[PDB]
Amino acid sequence: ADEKAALVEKYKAVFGAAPMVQSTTYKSRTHIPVSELSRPELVDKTVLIRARVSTTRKKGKMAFMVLRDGSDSVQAMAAVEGDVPKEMIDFMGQIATESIVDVEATVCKVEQPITSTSHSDIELKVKKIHTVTESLRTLPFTLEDASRKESKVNLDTRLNSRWMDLRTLASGAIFRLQSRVCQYFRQFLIDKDFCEIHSPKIINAPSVFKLEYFNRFAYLAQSPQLYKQMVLQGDVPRVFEVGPVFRSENTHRHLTEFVGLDVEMRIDEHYYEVLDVAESLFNYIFERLATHTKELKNVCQQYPFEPLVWKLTPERIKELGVGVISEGVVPTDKFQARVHNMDSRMLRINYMHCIELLNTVLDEKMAPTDDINTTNEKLLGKLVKERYGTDFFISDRFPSSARPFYTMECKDDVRFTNSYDMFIRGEEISSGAQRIHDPDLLLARAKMLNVDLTPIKEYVDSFRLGAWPHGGFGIGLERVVMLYLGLSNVRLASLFPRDPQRTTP
Amino acid sequence: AALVEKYKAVFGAAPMVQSTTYKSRTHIPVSELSRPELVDKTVLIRARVSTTRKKGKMAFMVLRDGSDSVQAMAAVEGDVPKEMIDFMGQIATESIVDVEATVCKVEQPITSTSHSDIELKVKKIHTVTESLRTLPFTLEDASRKESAEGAKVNLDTRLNSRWMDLRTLASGAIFRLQSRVCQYFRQFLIDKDFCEIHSPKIINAPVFKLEYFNRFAYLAQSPQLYKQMVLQGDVPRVFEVGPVFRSENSNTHRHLTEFVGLDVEMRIDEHYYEVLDVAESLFNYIFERLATHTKELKNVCQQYPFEPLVWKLTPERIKELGVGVISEGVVPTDKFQARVHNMDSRMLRINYMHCIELLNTVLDEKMAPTDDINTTNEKLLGKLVKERYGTDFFISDRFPSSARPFYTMECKDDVRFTNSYDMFIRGEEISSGAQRIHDPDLLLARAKMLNVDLTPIKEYVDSFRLGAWPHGGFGIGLERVVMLYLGLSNVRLASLFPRDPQRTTP
């Protein structure tokens, strides 16, 4: 009964549970990631791979597994050979789904029908296999069920075990794309000499999440708005910030905490200088996102979408009489739409003409200063898509009633302001404006809006020692990912979402 | 009356900028005024009035935009009347003006300005916005070295009108360098295929407590738990740049209640030295690129003198002391068994127990190998390291278990110590890195030993139960790294609108 016990010690080097990885060795073996397995020079080579068990089963005298690491997966198999005992096949067949294994395997090129694994051309012949960590055998839900198209794992169940959901193809791709949006946002602005700033999220007064702050109370900032303006009055010419923002005032489209992408800059003459930057920024981001075809397809396979169109065609510009600012071409288009140039071809419609366009289909007509609510923003976006062919446009010169106290009014008509909104797929994504850089007019607009600026005396004071004309805009990161991908719920694009009912994980 | 209207085109208050024209004039920034193709040209500049004075039939100003300054003057001649020289003499300093002026070369350079080779001959000048004539403090006083004779501005007055303070050379340069630290941090890690994450700052349980609708919530001290959990969703490598919150009521020159964390977490194949390898290469990358921003470094140094950071041993010192070289298999003969990974970055590593022995060479009260190195001791250690090895940067390897959090992996050979390290800049801790415990049961066991209550964080523990990757990571305070790099006296000099227990404004 002891030689059989010694056979346990013989097979320990071939299969079983490896000792816990505990920094006892350094660079003692070469670890090949699953993503590199289609490198041609690895064919017929024996490699060491660490991967998740997607599935594994004993069948006949063999074991078959799919190994996975994020978006990359590969078939693995083992058969009873001289080097490989039948007990290893039993061991492979019973490893729990989602366990992490170290596999020593020969890379074999194979000709077989395409399956779900992404490395179609190759298969691993397994020589040794050890568990690195073992998964519980009860999962909160399977990866496949979490990956189904919508008509099932409901959203709250997926969010409660987000570490499991993130392993799906679409969820992984969504957050890789989110990282790319941040990257492209910053790179564009760094190229244009914008300085990054970090401003406080704890503020003295609501300008409202109230917090206990040692002996007194403080509050969480809704946005860096006031600080990004104040820093320009410290003579920094242009700034951006990427950081958390908090909104206490529960839909499928909004969160209580999210990430703001914020910009503020001096202007020489006109807030169109801000809009020019904003349009070029979005064009840059959209152009670069388009190159991430792996991620886009991995989102699309679970959450089908039509790729965003953000440019008018040159043909449609000509047919409709759309104006071209950089060319001095005045529009003949009935709604007086314009693009800045024939390269980005991004649609701008004045707010009053946006109302006129909505009024073509509305029975109850809107006045030129009426506010466009959420149902009518989607309707406007649909009318814009049908007439001009684009999913992205700007509405220019918003009514004064619809804008915050720091928005510069138009000199010719104070019913309107030096401001604009941007829309993606008929939903608002960014507002930009010239700010009021004069303290007296800033207080005057606040008083008109019955907003008391007494709690933010320092902000007002920051304009009193000489101020630069300036403007800026902000963008919700999760929201721009949601709208770009056409997702149904903004929580699909927030790693650990926060809303009035959710504070965990 | 018609004469007063003529003069209005020449000088006075311009209409408020209100988006009535677009690209109607070419505004030349002050930074461009030394371009040779601007000599003898009349140009339009928008600038701050730093100083202005009248002297007979002439007015003399210094116009400024951040670090760029130039002298401007006007004389009563031709279409410039005495009324305009009077106007220039009475503009309040810090007003912003639009000036039409000819760029002229000068023989004797004007050393009080950065554009010393040229001078502006003013033809037109209008105020864009007017400053109060009563300033909270002058730029001159706010720029004065603490050692120099004359009025200085104290820190609270500085922060109470931070928009004025930021206009000084040194303060502006500090925050340009802060931006560059973030930039190079992210670019290094993006280059190495680290993914950026954004994790929540509101958490359901601890100690800043906030009202959260019908319940209470808390602010996260750091993204520590989330950055580990995301690796269990199979993201191989992550970083985060965002706010962090410390709830300790500490009002010192070094502590902020809100600051910015630069956080990294990554899988490891075998060893937490893989984490330390990344951290050292990351700091090398940042320091090498910060050193190229000579304009900003000199603009800090003129007010706040510092010796540039040395973060590498020289090849000669390595040989002289017998420091080991990991990538070349060179075993140290150094009495304190120091090592560098490689001969390119040459960044010093000393085992914690040899750090204790080094301290003991000057201590009468000898420390034990497991004793903790406090804050008076960290600066003594960094001085000993600087004197022996010649470097302002080093890591101390394998910290005692009693000094580390519950999630730190212990050494298999000796559970008195952990798979962890600290990095030091100028004798002060800047970053801690470690292998984490990726096994749920051992993680609960270490928390129990440390008497740490894990009931408020069941989801973090649960994230390791469905298969977990071995992993590790580190965090860096952004304001503190700028402060220690530049040798600043107070962390509030490197935080735009600082937060401490007594300060929530501006």
Short mmCIF file of C-alpha atoms in Angstrom, two decimals, chain A residues 62-467:
data_model
loop_
_atom_site.label_atom_id
_atom_site.label_comp_id
_atom_site.label_asym_id
_atom_site.label_seq_id
_atom_site.Cartn_x
_atom_site.Cartn_y
_atom_site.Cartn_z
CA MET A 62 -8.37 12.05 -23.49
CA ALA A 63 -9.01 15.41 -21.86
CA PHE A 64 -10.02 18.53 -23.79
CA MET A 65 -9.84 22.09 -22.50
CA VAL A 66 -10.28 25.63 -23.71
CA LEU A 67 -7.75 27.98 -22.15
CA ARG A 68 -8.49 31.69 -22.03
CA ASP A 69 -6.86 35.00 -21.13
CA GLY A 70 -9.25 37.84 -21.82
CA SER A 71 -9.94 38.04 -25.55
CA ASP A 72 -7.47 35.26 -26.48
CA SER A 73 -8.35 31.58 -26.21
CA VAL A 74 -6.83 28.31 -27.42
CA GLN A 75 -7.74 24.62 -27.52
CA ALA A 76 -5.69 22.23 -25.37
CA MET A 77 -5.78 18.45 -25.15
CA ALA A 78 -3.92 15.58 -23.56
CA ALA A 79 -3.78 11.86 -24.24
CA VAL A 80 -2.28 8.94 -22.34
CA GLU A 81 1.34 8.65 -23.50
CA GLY A 82 4.53 7.40 -21.90
CA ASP A 83 5.20 10.83 -20.41
CA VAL A 84 1.51 11.41 -19.61
CA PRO A 85 -0.37 9.03 -17.26
CA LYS A 86 -4.10 8.30 -17.21
CA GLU A 87 -4.30 10.01 -13.81
CA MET A 88 -3.36 13.32 -15.45
CA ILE A 89 -6.30 12.99 -17.85
CA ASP A 90 -8.60 12.43 -14.87
CA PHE A 91 -7.03 15.43 -13.15
CA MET A 92 -7.48 17.70 -16.18
CA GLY A 93 -11.10 16.64 -16.66
CA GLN A 94 -12.10 17.66 -13.12
CA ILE A 95 -10.38 21.05 -12.75
CA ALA A 96 -13.01 23.63 -11.85
CA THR A 97 -14.09 26.10 -14.52
CA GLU A 98 -12.31 29.51 -14.09
CA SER A 99 -9.32 27.96 -12.28
CA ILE A 100 -5.91 29.37 -13.25
CA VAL A 101 -3.53 26.68 -14.57
CA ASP A 102 0.12 26.57 -15.54
CA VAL A 103 0.42 24.37 -18.64
CA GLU A 104 3.52 22.98 -20.30
CA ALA A 105 2.41 22.20 -23.86
CA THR A 106 3.67 21.69 -27.40
CA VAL A 107 2.27 24.21 -29.87
CA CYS A 108 0.77 22.27 -32.79
CA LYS A 109 -0.56 23.75 -36.02
CA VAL A 110 -3.93 22.21 -36.90
CA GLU A 111 -6.46 22.34 -39.73
CA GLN A 112 -9.94 22.25 -38.19
CA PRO A 113 -13.22 24.16 -38.53
CA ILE A 114 -13.32 27.53 -36.80
CA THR A 115 -14.69 27.32 -33.27
CA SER A 116 -15.18 29.88 -30.52
CA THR A 117 -11.47 30.00 -29.64
CA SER A 118 -9.55 32.89 -31.18
CA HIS A 119 -6.33 30.97 -31.95
CA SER A 120 -7.91 28.88 -34.72
CA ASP A 121 -4.65 27.76 -36.34
CA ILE A 122 -3.11 25.99 -33.32
CA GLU A 123 -3.78 23.49 -30.55
CA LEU A 124 -1.78 22.77 -27.40
CA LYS A 125 -0.73 19.18 -26.64
CA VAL A 126 -0.48 19.22 -22.85
CA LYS A 127 2.57 17.60 -21.20
CA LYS A 128 2.18 18.98 -17.66
CA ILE A 129 -0.60 20.88 -15.95
CA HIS A 130 -0.83 22.33 -12.46
CA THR A 131 -3.47 24.48 -10.82
CA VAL A 132 -2.20 27.90 -9.79
CA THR A 133 -5.44 28.77 -8.02
CA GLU A 134 -8.66 26.73 -7.92
CA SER A 135 -12.02 28.36 -8.57
CA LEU A 136 -15.08 27.59 -6.49
CA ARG A 137 -17.16 25.05 -8.38
CA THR A 138 -20.31 27.18 -7.90
CA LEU A 139 -20.12 30.25 -10.10
CA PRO A 140 -22.49 33.24 -9.63
CA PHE A 141 -23.28 32.81 -13.40
CA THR A 142 -21.45 31.32 -16.36
CA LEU A 143 -19.40 33.42 -18.75
CA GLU A 144 -21.50 32.20 -21.67
CA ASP A 145 -24.76 33.23 -20.01
CA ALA A 146 -23.26 36.64 -19.21
CA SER A 147 -22.28 36.96 -22.90
CA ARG A 148 -25.74 36.49 -24.42
CA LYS A 149 -27.43 39.09 -26.60
CA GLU A 150 -30.24 41.02 -24.92
CA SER A 151 -33.87 40.12 -25.76
CA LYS A 152 -29.87 35.84 -19.17
CA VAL A 153 -27.92 37.33 -16.28
CA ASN A 154 -29.62 40.48 -15.13
CA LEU A 155 -27.54 43.62 -14.75
CA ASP A 156 -27.60 43.74 -10.97
CA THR A 157 -26.33 40.15 -10.75
CA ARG A 158 -23.48 40.91 -13.16
CA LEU A 159 -22.55 44.09 -11.28
CA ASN A 160 -22.54 42.28 -7.94
CA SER A 161 -19.82 39.92 -9.28
CA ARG A 162 -18.19 42.36 -11.64
CA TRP A 163 -14.84 40.53 -11.52
CA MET A 164 -16.57 37.62 -13.29
CA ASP A 165 -18.46 39.78 -15.80
CA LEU A 166 -15.29 41.62 -16.82
CA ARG A 167 -13.99 38.32 -18.22
CA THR A 168 -16.55 38.34 -21.06
CA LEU A 169 -15.44 39.47 -24.52
CA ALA A 170 -17.71 42.51 -24.72
CA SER A 171 -17.16 43.73 -21.17
CA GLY A 172 -13.39 43.44 -21.55
CA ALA A 173 -13.54 45.28 -24.88
CA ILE A 174 -15.74 48.05 -23.46
CA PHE A 175 -13.24 48.91 -20.77
CA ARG A 176 -10.25 48.68 -23.09
CA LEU A 177 -12.03 51.17 -25.34
CA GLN A 178 -12.75 53.34 -22.28
CA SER A 179 -9.01 53.44 -21.57
CA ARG A 180 -8.36 54.41 -25.21
CA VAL A 181 -10.85 57.32 -25.01
CA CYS A 182 -8.93 58.69 -22.01
CA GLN A 183 -5.63 58.17 -23.83
CA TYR A 184 -6.76 59.91 -27.01
CA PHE A 185 -8.42 62.77 -25.12
CA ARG A 186 -5.17 63.54 -23.27
CA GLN A 187 -2.81 63.03 -26.20
CA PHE A 188 -4.76 65.40 -28.44
CA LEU A 189 -4.74 68.11 -25.78
CA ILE A 190 -1.09 67.58 -24.77
CA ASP A 191 -0.21 67.99 -28.48
CA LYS A 192 -2.06 71.33 -28.35
CA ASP A 193 -0.17 72.53 -25.25
CA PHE A 194 -2.96 71.98 -22.71
CA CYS A 195 -1.61 71.55 -19.17
CA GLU A 196 -3.09 68.83 -16.95
CA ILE A 197 -4.50 70.03 -13.61
CA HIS A 198 -5.80 68.27 -10.51
CA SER A 199 -8.36 70.25 -8.55
CA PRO A 200 -10.01 69.27 -5.26
CA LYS A 201 -13.14 67.17 -5.10
CA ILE A 202 -13.87 68.30 -1.53
CA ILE A 203 -15.31 71.81 -1.55
CA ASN A 204 -16.45 74.21 1.13
CA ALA A 205 -20.05 74.80 0.03
CA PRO A 206 -22.50 73.36 -2.55
CA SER A 207 -21.91 76.24 -5.05
CA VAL A 208 -24.89 68.30 -2.83
CA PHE A 209 -23.18 65.31 -1.22
CA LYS A 210 -22.48 66.61 2.30
CA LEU A 211 -19.59 65.03 4.19
CA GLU A 212 -18.25 65.22 7.72
CA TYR A 213 -14.93 67.10 7.57
CA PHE A 214 -13.24 67.01 11.00
CA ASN A 215 -15.20 69.50 13.11
CA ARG A 216 -17.39 70.80 10.27
CA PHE A 217 -19.06 69.94 6.97
CA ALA A 218 -17.81 69.92 3.40
CA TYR A 219 -19.25 68.76 0.07
CA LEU A 220 -18.28 66.85 -3.06
CA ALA A 221 -17.70 68.83 -6.26
CA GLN A 222 -20.11 68.26 -9.14
CA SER A 223 -17.32 69.11 -11.56
CA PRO A 224 -14.02 71.00 -11.69
CA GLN A 225 -15.84 73.93 -13.40
CA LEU A 226 -14.97 76.66 -10.90
CA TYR A 227 -11.34 75.56 -10.43
CA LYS A 228 -10.55 75.15 -14.10
CA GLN A 229 -11.61 78.77 -14.60
CA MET A 230 -9.67 80.01 -11.57
CA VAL A 231 -6.42 78.42 -12.80
CA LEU A 232 -6.62 80.39 -16.06
CA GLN A 233 -6.63 83.50 -13.86
CA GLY A 234 -3.27 82.22 -12.57
CA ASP A 235 -2.07 82.74 -16.20
CA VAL A 236 -2.06 79.06 -17.26
CA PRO A 237 -3.24 79.42 -20.91
CA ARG A 238 -5.11 76.12 -21.33
CA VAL A 239 -5.88 73.16 -19.05
CA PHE A 240 -7.57 69.79 -18.96
CA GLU A 241 -8.62 67.50 -16.11
CA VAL A 242 -9.62 63.85 -15.96
CA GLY A 243 -11.21 62.87 -12.70
CA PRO A 244 -14.29 61.89 -10.72
CA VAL A 245 -17.44 63.99 -10.71
CA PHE A 246 -20.50 63.54 -8.51
CA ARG A 247 -24.15 64.27 -9.25
CA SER A 248 -26.85 63.84 -6.63
CA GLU A 249 -29.62 65.12 -8.93
CA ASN A 250 -31.93 56.74 -11.36
CA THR A 251 -32.18 56.08 -15.09
CA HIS A 252 -30.47 53.64 -17.44
CA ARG A 253 -28.46 56.62 -18.70
CA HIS A 254 -27.07 58.31 -15.56
CA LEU A 255 -24.81 57.59 -12.55
CA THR A 256 -24.18 59.34 -9.24
CA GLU A 257 -20.40 59.16 -9.59
CA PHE A 258 -18.58 59.10 -12.93
CA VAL A 259 -15.51 60.45 -14.68
CA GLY A 260 -15.34 63.93 -16.21
CA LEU A 261 -13.10 64.89 -19.13
CA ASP A 262 -12.81 68.64 -18.73
CA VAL A 263 -11.20 71.42 -20.78
CA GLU A 264 -10.80 75.19 -20.26
CA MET A 265 -8.85 77.66 -22.39
CA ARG A 266 -8.26 81.33 -23.04
CA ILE A 267 -10.08 82.72 -26.02
CA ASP A 268 -8.86 85.62 -28.18
CA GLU A 269 -12.27 86.65 -29.63
CA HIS A 270 -14.96 83.98 -29.76
CA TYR A 271 -16.20 80.76 -28.17
CA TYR A 272 -15.97 79.17 -31.64
CA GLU A 273 -12.28 78.87 -30.69
CA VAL A 274 -13.46 76.46 -27.99
CA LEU A 275 -15.87 74.69 -30.34
CA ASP A 276 -13.06 74.32 -32.92
CA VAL A 277 -10.94 72.51 -30.31
CA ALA A 278 -13.88 70.38 -29.17
CA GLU A 279 -14.79 69.29 -32.72
CA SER A 280 -11.16 68.50 -33.58
CA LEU A 281 -10.83 66.59 -30.32
CA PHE A 282 -13.89 64.44 -31.04
CA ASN A 283 -12.77 63.90 -34.65
CA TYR A 284 -9.36 62.75 -33.39
CA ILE A 285 -10.91 60.38 -30.83
CA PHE A 286 -13.42 58.91 -33.28
CA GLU A 287 -10.75 58.43 -35.96
CA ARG A 288 -8.50 56.53 -33.55
CA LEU A 289 -11.27 54.46 -31.93
CA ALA A 290 -12.19 53.25 -35.42
CA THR A 291 -8.79 51.51 -35.70
CA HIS A 292 -9.50 49.24 -32.70
CA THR A 293 -11.35 46.69 -34.79
CA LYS A 294 -10.70 43.76 -32.45
CA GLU A 295 -12.42 45.54 -29.55
CA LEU A 296 -15.24 46.94 -31.68
CA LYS A 297 -16.14 43.50 -33.08
CA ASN A 298 -15.93 41.97 -29.59
CA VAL A 299 -18.45 44.55 -28.36
CA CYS A 300 -20.63 44.18 -31.46
CA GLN A 301 -20.99 40.40 -31.21
CA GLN A 302 -22.97 40.68 -27.94
CA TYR A 303 -24.28 44.26 -28.34
CA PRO A 304 -24.80 44.92 -32.06
CA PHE A 305 -24.40 48.52 -33.20
CA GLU A 306 -24.07 50.47 -36.40
CA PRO A 307 -20.69 52.24 -36.50
CA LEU A 308 -20.97 55.88 -35.59
CA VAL A 309 -21.09 58.31 -38.52
CA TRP A 310 -19.81 61.73 -37.45
CA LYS A 311 -18.98 63.35 -40.83
CA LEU A 312 -21.31 64.56 -43.54
CA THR A 313 -20.42 63.42 -47.01
CA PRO A 314 -19.11 66.07 -49.43
CA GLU A 315 -22.00 65.08 -51.68
CA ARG A 316 -24.64 65.80 -49.03
CA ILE A 317 -22.98 69.12 -48.14
CA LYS A 318 -23.26 70.18 -51.79
CA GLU A 319 -26.81 68.86 -52.37
CA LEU A 320 -28.27 70.62 -49.32
CA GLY A 321 -26.27 73.86 -49.42
CA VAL A 322 -24.51 73.30 -46.09
CA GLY A 323 -22.17 76.20 -45.42
CA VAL A 324 -18.41 75.85 -44.91
CA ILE A 325 -16.89 78.23 -42.38
CA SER A 326 -13.21 77.83 -43.29
CA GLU A 327 -14.13 78.45 -46.95
CA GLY A 328 -16.42 81.42 -46.29
CA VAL A 329 -19.31 79.55 -47.95
CA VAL A 330 -22.65 80.90 -46.68
CA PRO A 331 -25.37 78.24 -46.41
CA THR A 332 -28.40 78.01 -48.62
CA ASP A 333 -29.64 75.02 -46.59
CA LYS A 334 -33.13 75.72 -45.26
CA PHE A 335 -31.94 75.12 -41.68
CA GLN A 336 -28.70 77.03 -42.37
CA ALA A 337 -26.47 74.16 -41.31
CA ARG A 338 -22.69 74.61 -41.51
CA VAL A 339 -19.51 72.58 -41.20
CA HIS A 340 -16.21 74.17 -40.22
CA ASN A 341 -14.26 72.46 -43.00
CA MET A 342 -14.37 69.76 -45.66
CA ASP A 343 -11.97 67.52 -43.75
CA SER A 344 -13.87 66.88 -40.52
CA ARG A 345 -17.25 67.88 -42.04
CA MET A 346 -18.96 68.12 -38.64
CA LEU A 347 -22.50 69.53 -38.59
CA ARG A 348 -23.46 72.71 -36.72
CA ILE A 349 -27.06 73.95 -36.56
CA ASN A 350 -28.12 77.13 -34.81
CA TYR A 351 -30.51 76.49 -31.93
CA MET A 352 -33.39 78.43 -33.48
CA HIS A 353 -33.07 76.39 -36.67
CA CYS A 354 -33.00 73.23 -34.53
CA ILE A 355 -36.38 74.35 -33.18
CA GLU A 356 -37.58 74.99 -36.73
CA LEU A 357 -36.55 71.46 -37.67
CA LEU A 358 -38.36 69.92 -34.71
CA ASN A 359 -41.40 72.04 -35.62
CA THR A 360 -41.65 70.29 -39.02
CA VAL A 361 -42.92 67.17 -37.23
CA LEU A 362 -44.45 68.63 -34.05
CA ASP A 363 -48.13 69.44 -33.74
CA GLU A 364 -47.56 71.70 -30.71
CA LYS A 365 -45.01 74.17 -32.05
CA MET A 366 -42.03 75.31 -29.99
CA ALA A 367 -40.99 78.94 -29.57
CA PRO A 368 -37.35 79.81 -30.45
CA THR A 369 -36.40 80.09 -26.75
CA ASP A 370 -38.22 76.96 -25.56
CA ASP A 371 -36.03 74.28 -24.01
CA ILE A 372 -35.49 70.99 -25.82
CA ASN A 373 -36.15 68.15 -23.33
CA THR A 374 -34.89 64.58 -23.61
CA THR A 375 -37.60 63.18 -25.88
CA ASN A 376 -37.13 66.10 -28.25
CA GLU A 377 -33.33 65.76 -28.24
CA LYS A 378 -33.73 62.19 -29.52
CA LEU A 379 -36.30 63.38 -32.06
CA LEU A 380 -33.94 66.15 -33.24
CA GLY A 381 -31.13 63.63 -33.53
CA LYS A 382 -33.32 61.39 -35.67
CA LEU A 383 -34.34 64.30 -37.91
CA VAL A 384 -30.68 65.29 -38.25
CA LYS A 385 -29.67 61.72 -39.13
CA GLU A 386 -32.41 61.47 -41.77
CA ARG A 387 -31.72 64.85 -43.39
CA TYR A 388 -27.91 65.15 -43.09
CA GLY A 389 -26.83 61.54 -42.64
CA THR A 390 -24.85 62.02 -39.42
CA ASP A 391 -25.04 60.67 -35.85
CA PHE A 392 -23.04 63.62 -34.46
CA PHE A 393 -23.88 67.33 -34.51
CA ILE A 394 -23.63 70.61 -32.58
CA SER A 395 -26.54 72.88 -31.65
CA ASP A 396 -25.23 76.43 -31.35
CA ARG A 397 -26.40 79.47 -29.32
CA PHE A 398 -28.51 77.97 -26.51
CA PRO A 399 -31.22 79.99 -24.73
CA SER A 400 -30.13 81.89 -21.64
CA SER A 401 -32.79 80.21 -19.50
CA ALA A 402 -31.18 76.81 -20.14
CA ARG A 403 -27.62 77.72 -19.12
CA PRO A 404 -25.70 78.19 -15.83
CA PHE A 405 -24.92 81.55 -14.25
CA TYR A 406 -21.32 81.61 -15.57
CA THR A 407 -22.39 81.49 -19.27
CA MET A 408 -21.70 84.61 -21.35
CA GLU A 409 -24.87 86.00 -22.95
CA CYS A 410 -24.92 87.05 -26.61
CA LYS A 411 -24.25 90.75 -27.12
CA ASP A 412 -26.98 91.14 -29.74
CA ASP A 413 -29.72 89.16 -27.92
CA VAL A 414 -29.38 88.27 -24.23
CA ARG A 415 -32.15 85.71 -24.70
CA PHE A 416 -29.32 83.50 -26.01
CA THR A 417 -25.79 82.65 -24.92
CA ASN A 418 -22.31 82.09 -26.33
CA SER A 419 -22.66 78.34 -25.90
CA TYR A 420 -23.39 75.05 -27.70
CA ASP A 421 -24.29 71.41 -27.02
CA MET A 422 -22.93 68.33 -28.79
CA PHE A 423 -25.07 65.26 -29.50
CA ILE A 424 -24.16 61.64 -30.27
CA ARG A 425 -26.97 59.39 -31.51
CA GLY A 426 -29.47 62.01 -30.42
CA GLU A 427 -28.23 62.32 -26.82
CA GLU A 428 -26.33 65.21 -25.31
CA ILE A 429 -22.64 64.50 -24.65
CA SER A 430 -20.95 67.86 -24.06
CA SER A 431 -21.81 71.52 -23.45
CA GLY A 432 -19.29 74.27 -24.14
CA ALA A 433 -19.39 78.01 -23.73
CA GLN A 434 -17.59 81.27 -23.23
CA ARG A 435 -17.64 82.15 -19.52
CA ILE A 436 -18.35 85.52 -17.93
CA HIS A 437 -14.86 86.78 -17.01
CA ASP A 438 -16.14 90.10 -15.56
CA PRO A 439 -17.07 89.94 -11.84
CA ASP A 440 -19.90 92.48 -12.06
CA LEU A 441 -21.64 90.79 -15.00
CA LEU A 442 -21.03 87.40 -13.39
CA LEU A 443 -22.85 88.52 -10.25
CA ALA A 444 -25.56 90.16 -12.40
CA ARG A 445 -26.34 86.93 -14.22
CA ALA A 446 -26.32 85.02 -10.92
CA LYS A 447 -28.76 87.48 -9.36
CA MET A 448 -30.97 87.22 -12.45
CA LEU A 449 -30.93 83.43 -12.04
CA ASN A 450 -31.60 83.77 -8.28
CA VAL A 451 -28.34 81.95 -7.62
CA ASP A 452 -26.51 83.13 -4.50
CA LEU A 453 -22.75 83.28 -5.09
CA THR A 454 -22.00 84.14 -1.45
CA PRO A 455 -20.78 80.54 -0.82
CA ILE A 456 -18.27 80.81 -3.70
CA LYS A 457 -16.74 84.20 -2.94
CA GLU A 458 -13.24 83.00 -3.87
CA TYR A 459 -14.33 82.02 -7.38
CA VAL A 460 -15.79 85.48 -7.96
CA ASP A 461 -12.71 87.13 -6.42
CA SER A 462 -10.45 85.20 -8.82
CA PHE A 463 -11.76 87.43 -11.67
CA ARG A 464 -11.01 90.70 -9.89
CA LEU A 465 -7.22 90.99 -10.42
CA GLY A 466 -7.39 91.01 -14.22
CA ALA A 467 -9.05 88.14 -16.07
#
